[model samples]
Target: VVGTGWTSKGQITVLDMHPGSGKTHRVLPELIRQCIDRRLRTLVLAPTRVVLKEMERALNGKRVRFHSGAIVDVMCHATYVNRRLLPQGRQNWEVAIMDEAHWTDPHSIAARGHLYTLAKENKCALVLMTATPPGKSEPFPESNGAITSEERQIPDGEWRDGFDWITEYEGRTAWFVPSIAKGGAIARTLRQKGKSVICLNSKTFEKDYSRVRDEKPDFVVTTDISEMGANLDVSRVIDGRTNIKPEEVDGKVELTGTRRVTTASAAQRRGRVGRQDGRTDEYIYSGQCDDDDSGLVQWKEAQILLDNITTVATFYGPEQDKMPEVAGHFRLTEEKRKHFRHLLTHCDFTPWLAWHVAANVSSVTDRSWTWEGPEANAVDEASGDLVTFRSPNGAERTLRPVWKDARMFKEGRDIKEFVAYASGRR
Candidate 1:
């Protein structure tokens, strides 16, 4: 059903389906079988290693195998890019499938270009799969010849009350939280109430899922890492990020104080529960869900430009003179191009180091900073006001105190200070 209407040669097809509609389990395996039947070498790319493992499990017993005959190779997108694995390598893949394809948006600073070029070169059919497509504001460019399948919607699951009901409910539950810190806090609170808990975020996701299945924790607290292409069986899911806000009460505007999680994400979170049978409940904690996904797309674009400049540099290599070309590749605006060019030329920063510093420059709080890298643990004992680190070329760089209040850096002011000081602007 996934590839029913699309051609399987020299074109891109998007299989957009509901989360619980067996896109990975039912659809993917059949697609792979079809490719094998044609004797086409296939490459399946997933976002995370966990997803890769799930794919392996999905294709385990079938006559068509993922890796046994060398016709199909399942790997992470990160692994594919890091290893510089080309689609037309020794295998000469005739079909390339990118699962959770939203992560591989060509406009963003991802390894999408590499895959796209290789697939084009080899005349391979490129398949992009995701439940949540990008917004109309930032739609996938038409040049790629991508056709999106008719969206397969599922019946709504049983809804339930808030955390109060969760506390009293007897069955196993999961709380889809916004951040790692919040998940930890909730896990601790649940544990204090004698509920067995497991807090799984980006850092601990590798082994935590297995632990959840084996240990059978009463409340499995998780972030977005568990929301995509994961088969987690739980009785109920508490959509902690979705909160109903009173925008206007008695002609007075009220602050929502809720994370703007998109409707697509809410659907994915809801699908985590009620997968096996009907005995399930979904809870929207407080605020109404955000229908527009443009915010997410913009946020993702900004994050890549600001936080992953170095990563882009790593893949494309540092090209100081070709700054415009590089910027254009990543779809950087004039303003962002200036900042990007400044870091590369003025600061003499390698792509990796620039990204490392930019990502960590943002504060965890007003006073606290997210210190990373090899020298992250080291302290500036003499000044106590400067953060120092060595660049990839063994050049020492120091970020001196610029703000009198010391709180300006907490809310993104440090980015300006960092660029300025590094480039001798101050």
Candidate 2:
């Protein structure tokens, strides 16, 4: 049984459990009942609507009730962040439980900031449930407590020769591909062999899944969208992108290439099966890839940092003094903190502009120098270039030809349009 210390403390808690270990099936329903008995207004968050619906189904099936007439709310993380989906005049919730909480990592810093603000406003405790927690290198908000479960070992299944071996297997299977295009092509090939198949990707999954699942196709070709949350009770699983080659050099082993999917993702995909019944098998196409040790790439991290900084500045005005606090929230290095300070002071750029340029032009360090020029003769030197212009602060800026080709512009009007479009205001 899971403990409930962090729930009462009103602080963030990490419930790190092994995949397929009944996190959703066993733990969540019990917690919901506990919160109801305690009369704490509760909110549950999942990565997608499909997952949220699944949670609702589980709760209803369990017949968990609020004897005191309290209620629990369920919403997708996107809906929670968007706020428009929220009911008008919704009262503050006392507990927020998030499944697949790794989605709140640096990659989604804007969402993370919003969630943090929500918790602070409501004085709500946060429960982050995930099988794959962020590595040590990644910067996550400090949690009050963590509940970690021991890894459940699975026996090694039969090693198939190659990708074509799928044809020989005779059972319901889920083929995991790296790209949507590949999944479609593979599904087509499987269909040609008189096999029932369904192809699911990011684009079609949300709307098409209900109809697609009705068929119960023999083969489900999918991308990483089904790696978590979404459940498919298949008899076998296949990982299509595990091509790893290690070389021994200088008396040490080094991986020659990186994989598109991490080991954690592979585990989640495998967990999709063996869920309903104890009998299911997983097969890797190539070789297994090593787990990720390094954190987000430098450019990605910079983008996240700038985006969160912009979020803060958008609501509170360009509070230049808050740069250090924002940087501290992301755990930025002293060098990076100094660099951002210089960009704001010397370059005279707003947080939104900095974030836009970092996202469109280049890395943060490169954007710092690339967007600056002498105010005098700036337009005269680049007269014919449409992508070169000056900012509101009198600093000259230019977009590279590649960025220009991608419809990025430097004019004040275009910047507003770009910001609107990027923020979904347009």
Candidate 3:
């Protein structure tokens, strides 16, 4: 097993396994047994309270005391340097395990550095496991066999539900939403239509599972907080918050900082189903819209959200210093800004986009370019070049509607110039 090999290595190991693969259930016990054979201790860490509880239950009677809720000490490099958890020894446990390691962002300043510190400072066999692992600059740990995505295809739903979909099925269905307010509304609406529903909310995090346990609900509506390793055999997985929201400005759709579900997250949610006995025929459903107008007109919300894939920004107004470096990331240059400004004077385009934009400078001589939102383009007709979106009445603007059109902005030699400029920035 990967666990036994990792124990022998006695170093930090990364496990890249997919969800519903049963790797965690299969490997960890063997790892714990190997550590206990040497009279050594093993510590397992969970990312969330929900997962920690599940781990604690599964690990009953083992020579292990599972710990969660990491405490970051300023004196140590590790953010999870809780003295209560780690005790006095530098090599506190013979082995350490971090579940849901994908939640840690390697480049983030606040928390991820601590994972590295915990592995390095403590002389123990550290194992980090997640369904999605970092793509490059890292390799996979030893595994008993290769993990494959062969049979795990997500069912298609006319491509409307971001990455999740909902279809009527024989078993229970859990629809995941962003907020309890909307979740409760949807649950009430579904119940009105005669579906047996259990509306689990933030309050349920501290409450008994008795409601869901005894109800035998046809549909369980909840937020992402409820998603863990539950064997619900869910009929459908509804992503209530996958789509991003865009604004209609001057007949043009502007993308914003809205929600678009990542592929990894979608797959993880979908995996919740069919784990009762490895049944894979169940369908996953993504939410269409808010619970307004009786769920009619489904795709508008999703379309607006998908538009954010084309969203770009430039620091403007007082947000420049505070903004994370976008100008450099976009490879925006002072000279290149001149070209886009000249195009904006046309009546069809206005100085207002529904979303944000990158401007070359505050004034022509400012020598400052950064990212800011639509308010940044709150314009100057005298300057004229700041004109942004095309007017609805002025001209029937040609629409390149999807993300592909957003990338199809190849107009002139400056296109060649811009590509050359951004080549090295990324």
Candidate 4:
């Protein structure tokens, strides 16, 4: 276990082991023991609802539902429980284990704000699961409250403005969108290296898990909740910018195909070739690419909030004197200014992004370039004991989606509440 910091810059690495080792079986027993011995109740968050349900069964002791509003316990009682219980403005949790930590992004208002706000308010021992730990520069103490002096002097007024700057972060997370224009090429590369592949999307996996099974494919790209909680080799390779900042070579914004990569997605996307161990596990990136850069770019709302013109000028806008440089950072230059202006025309500039870009000129700005979603994608292949869940009303249920796509998120609305209401036998 890692120590907790006010600004959440902590991570833990869990080794991928075989089944007979009882590594999977040991988690709950150990967790319960730790709580009893140390008297600390821990809250666990899973990536998929399926995983959460399975854990409910695997975990002994009490089946404490999250913020279910149940007064009395049926299976067992917990001294404390999950995040949902905190009425409108109170935190009742002291420990939270985020099963899927990759989703939290400072660039996102909801993902960035909700997690950090909860973490700080509770000052809880927040934990993250998954083999992929956050990268050194991936904005840890992820609660980006302050980056001014500790690691590097943030761009002149970034501390106050990082909150609003949507465009400032040129760091693009490349995704393999679901369309043909996306992974078609990369898929070929992996196959050329002599690897079998299975692409599981909602439809393919739901109708036929067996028919789609392959003797080998360096990877599987698809969307099927059934595979959730199952071991699919790596957790995620979410490190640096997956794509390059767009450039305007001849007036019309032209995209540079040669992207700047930070981590192993490219290599993994190609499939692990010629490795010593037959144990070489392939890669799969979940989630489809957004129609536009919706998923990849700093969300639109954050960008809109950042575009207040007067506020920009008052804070650290165009006329402000240049800030002192950190050992290795750049300020906005004329070329960058031109690029930024172009981008602002296309996508509206957030003051936060503009201020930072202007303050640090070395990093070129490409205004017209938007965060187009991923070109390639894949799904994880594995299976496990399905999970069970109980609602706040004292009813027990399992998670099997009736819809072709992910039920809740795909519906693009909150369905858990409806589940609780409709199913509660009370």
Candidate 5:
């Protein structure tokens, strides 16, 4: 189980985790293990459509799409897995793996249909991964931690938590696919080293039709035309953000209109690499070899908003569907609490996060328009100010209220400042 691991023991084990904490690494070889272990018949489930595709690619098969109505070949009979791989007439798999299993929490109509159908239908040793374990999501029974800290050190057969295999063995990796210009340096290197590069932007993005053609460069770079859907085998996304303003470049995508380049930077960057498939590294490089700075997005902002959101949601937000019984007032119920206890047995709040939900995300702040909502109010209660994020051990963090120039936000500068600070470099 990718989301929860409580109560699924003896024969089954469930493990839930926070996002960016590397969850897929658990699924990869485990399925391979089930096929090899003979008794190991595994089912891997991803909560979202995006995650599903990522899983498909990671699993090395798109054989399972959909037939007229019924679910067809999920993963074909490759060296990895097959529909017929399970024993005769036995639908019960050896291992049932779910990514973001909370998507079936049954709070909404979708949850019941999604989670119920999957969990109940599969009769194998079910394992679930959820960051927000249902009942006992906090305080270790024996100590202050969830499970004993010693237990956390126990490594997965092929999985490593909070440890990225890409960089651990390779050493200091980053994501750099988002680099715009100065790409030839890396491209040339990749080709010269005989690392075959495949470009996937031929679909309908409509850009300057420049192909890789085995160009000799130190690494490779792909523009938005290809990065969105293409997954290349690389370590990091070294985005050369030498952005060309309209006056600078003719055929570039003019980041005009309601400017949102800042918000979309991380997605654009992550799109550079496929899922965490053993070799892919989130190698992010901003500026150039000579300069280090705010890449596409500021480290502070990305770390605060998107990264935090990914981690929290992955760990506690119910990977796919949050268990309905655990939310709001329902959380107070003993039954629901008991269920949560079972669910959280495999969960750990490993990387305790720190956050401050803002009343106003934009620079154009109007006093009358701002109101601290529940998340904000909670931060205020803990930190004394909504602007400051009070984290563990009395750590305090805050986003720059003033723009890059430290100037008070002007209505005209809204888009500019937003783009600058969000990009992390002025």
Candidate 6:
């Protein structure tokens, strides 16, 4: 239920909080209570199973029900209303709540799923709950403001002690493992030592609650998924090391090292502890000196990826699937779709991408004849013109048209100006 929430008569709002400060423990129940005072019944949504169960824990005594599968036809007149989660047909609710709202990035296929559309059709007040804001996404809901944590200390828990004391607390402890094999190995060792352990990863994707309850796990171990809406009974967290190394192969941007965790993920893990009851002294166990050093992917870097991708679309046209896997994530809007079609008619296989498009690419202008290298080709678009160059030595390159006053090449020093701009720092 990460993307769907609404209040009757509709207004969108977002709540941003610093991770691991007991924000969830304090804020969520109070908000539900306030909604109750307003006579507003809520339909809550969480993206993951463990998180849904934690929501159930938060709403322990309230009229709540858990339904899985398609959210069709059940929500119309449910008797229980205080805390709930869903799928479905035309239905109405007093309010809808989404947890981990950051997961609703419109670019993701998950964004357009059932919960959000139903809530929108109902015209209810939509409240987004998340640790990070929606600044990185395009065309996201507007933010009103943020709420900070009451206490800022990191929880102090490590791997030495049994996370399981058979205590009153239901929120499970999270053990952030770097790899699935390592996680399983850790879980096996812990079980031999009489510890309750449950794991979440790609390997055990279709697992259910019955097995989890059977394990009575004290520790919920996993990789990146634990960074998000994973609400196991995690009072303490353990983080394994991962690093990001930037790489550029012939000016093509790509991730080259170990799959790195985002700074946002690290923050959420640090924030996970003491979040249930506002305890002031929670500590996170990572090698890092502080949370600030954990980093995020920048917007400009993302733009470069898209720019590089555009070359593939230009060459392959409808056959863009031939490009790398990273290209699959990009979708074209109607305008860009038309733009791509236009480029298909006029754009050539530029050397910048270094991709072969059979006869669709190359700088020979007239495909009937062969050039002795030392040539340049151009394609003009609404935004800008693109050019490709073949040096005398047969080295290939492409340049983005640099515009000064509406023209690409100048009268006084056309090639010189182009060469100077191309050779200099951008």
Best by TM-score: 1
Compose the digit string of candidate 2's lDDT tens values, residues 1-426. Answer: 456655664476667776666677788888888887777778777677677767767887332322104368777655453342122333556787878865422223334444455554546777767776544211112121221112222212223335455677666777777555466677777777778988776666787667556888888877777865776656667765442222223322233443545556655665565554334354444445454423322223333344333323211111122223343244234344444444333443333333334434434434333334333212222346434544445565553221221112321123444433333232
- Report the poorest 10 consecutive residues by lDDT, candidate 5: 348-357
Q: How accurate is candidate 6 locally (lDDT)?
A: 0.41
Residues 224-307 of candidate 4 have per-residue lDDT tens digits of: 222223333331212112332232232122233424332222222222111223333222232222112223223322232222
- Give the Cα lDDT of each candidate: 0.51, 0.51, 0.40, 0.31, 0.30, 0.41
Model 5 ranges with Cα > 4 A deviation = 1-27, 30-41, 45-94, 98-117, 120-198, 201-236, 239-426
Each candidate's root-mean-square deviation in Å?
A: 12.1, 12.4, 16.8, 20.4, 19.4, 17.4
TM-score for each of the candidates: 0.60, 0.58, 0.49, 0.36, 0.27, 0.41
Model 1: worst 10 consecutive residues (lDDT sum):
137-146
Q: What would the per-residue lDDT of candidate 3 be over residues 364-425, giving only the tens digit for each residue?
A: 32111211223432322344443233222343222222111111121111222222222222
How much is the lDDT of residue 124 in candidate 6? Answer: 58
- Name the regions of candidate 2 deviating beyond 4 angstroms: 60-71, 84-92, 104-122, 136-164, 242-258, 290-426
- Candidate 5, residue 130: how far the Cα is off, in Å: 10
Model 6 residue 422 distance off true place after TM-score fit, in angstroms: 51
Residue 388's C-alpha lDDT in candidate 6? Answer: 48
- Superposed by TM-score, candidate 3 places the C-alpha of residue 36 at a distance from the truth, in angstroms, of 1.2
Q: How would you encode candidate 5's per-residue C-alpha lDDT over 122-207 as one tens digit per residue?
A: 43354545443332332111111121111112111123235333223342222233222223344444445444443222121132
Residue 406 CA displacement from its true place in model 5, Å: 40
Error of 4 at 337 (Å): 36
lDDT of 3 at 4: 46
Per-residue alpha-carbon lDDT of model 6 for 1-426, expressed as tens digits? 223233455555566655543335566766676666566656655656566566667765344556542121112111111111111132455565566654412111122123333444554555556776444321111111221222222212234444443233444556666555567677776666666787776345336434544565777766655555544544456554343322333333333444434445555555445444434323345444222221222222222223323222111111122223343243343344333322222342112111222223333222211122223333223346554455445555454331121112321124434443343321
